[PDB]
Structures are given as structure tokens and as C-alpha cells.
């Protein structure tokens, strides 16, 4: 279109292998997830299969800069997003973001951004994809 | 509209005021900068005014991450936007980008993305806000 904003009120991650350890994760931690995306009405309207890696510890603030990649396929798509997130705030249950590009489909030549955060409830966030041509 | 691409083909650095090592860009250096934002039509539809600082180098890139401060005022509302930019992307043409609030007018609610190119022609660039509801 011009402009697409995809709400994704439930994310679940319905698969996680990782070594981060729980409280004290450090760089050279991974993580494998695999997602399903559901819409305002309850209805699953995609999927996300993605990695990550802590990379390295931001000197400002000792943040845990962890570079993530999936790619996300919806029902008409699908969307590739890669990029910098804090894992402090992964773990704080605040929002982050990183660049998203359609690579199918609806998607085609559209390009935005992938945000989500983790909410309270066990296994499960909230997100948001952003495009535009 | 839940979404909104502003597309602003050209944008002018009109006045700038910074410490930045032009051959040898480094961490500690500032600058402030005063922007005007075109349309496709060449219209003026706003101006930004804004700083950065360049904080870190990032190891996994050599990186020099900057961070952006910036209000942008359009003719129906003005947008807060800042964040983390690598300043050696900046100075080869490259995209950056970082959240934006909408504060007032037409985008108050919204958040998003600000986006911005600096083309290798004399003190322009283009860009690109995308928000949502």
C-alpha cells in the first residue's frame, strides 16, 4: 500500500533452545525460537522462526546487545526482520525493534519494522509490523 | 488511517554547528543541526532541529554509534524522534533510523520510525517517517 500496520496482540513461542543463563546472560548466548502470531480476534495469522546472539555489552549503560534474526510468514507473505535489540530490555518486558523487509507476497518491496515486547503472561508476547513502500 | 508514510524526498541541512572530525569522525564529538523537509513537489512541509553525540565504537562492526535527538515540525503536527544511529553509515549513504513519537496536531498518539539518507550531494538527504496507531 503506502502505509500497513500489522498488530500482533499475542505472539507465542511455542518452541525456545537456548543457553542464556536466566538472570546472568552474557555474550556468546544463543537462542532458536519459533512463534505463532495471533490477530485482535484470536485467529493465528503466521508464524516466526528466528535465532539470536548476545554480541557484545554496551559501554553506556551495560546494555546486552544481542543481534536477532527471523523470518516471519503470514497467511499473504512473508517478512524477513533483522537487527539490535538490548536484551535488558527483552528481559524487562519492554518494547524492542529492529528493521523488517517484505520479501513475498503482500510484502514485496515493502520495508519497515518488526517490534515486540514479552509481556507478564508465561511464553508469550505482544507485537507490531510497521511497513511501507 | 491506523498507518502513515511521510516521504520526504528531499531534506536540506540548513544550519549546522558540530566538533566532528571530517577525515577521522570520533566518540565525543557533537553536533546540532537545523533541517528543512520537502515533498515531491518541492513544498517545504516542515523543518527538524535536532543533535547527536557519537558515544562508542561497536566491535562487531567498528561501528561509531550516535545518538540523535531531533523535533520535527510539519505543517499539522510535530514528531519527537531519537535513538541509536552508526555514524559511519551516515557518512557513506547509508539508511539510518530511530523510534518517533508523534507530540501533536495530526500524529499525536502515533509512534513509529524516523528515516533518513544522507545522498552524497552537498548537506541533503532524503527521508521517511512511518507511524502507527
Do not use: C
Amino acid at each position: 500500500p503506502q502505509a500497513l500496520l500489522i498488530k500482533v496482540p499475542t505472539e507465542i513461542v511455542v518452541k525456545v533452545v537456548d543457553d542464556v543463563d536466566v538472570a546472568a546472560p552474557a555474550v556468546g548466548q544463543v537462542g532458536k525460537f519459533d512463534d505463532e502470531l495471533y490477530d485482535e480476534a484470536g485467529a493465528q495469522i503466521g508464524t516466526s522462526s528466528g535465532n539470536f546472539r548476545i554480541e557484545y555489552v554496551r559501554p553506556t549503560d551495560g546494555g546486552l546487545l544481542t543481534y536477532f534474526q527471523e523470518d516471519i510468514t503470514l497467511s499473504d507473505g512473508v517478512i524477513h526482520a533483522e537487527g539490535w535489540a538490548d536484551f535488558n530490555d527483552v528481559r524487562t518486558s519492554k518494547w524492542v525493534f529492529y528493521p523488517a523487509t517484505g520479501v513475498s507476497g503482500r510484502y514485496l518491496g515493502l520495508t519497515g519494522f518488526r517490534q515486540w515486547r514479552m509481556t507478564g503472561v508465561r511464553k508469550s508476547a505482544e507485537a507490531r509490523i510497521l511497513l511501507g513502500e
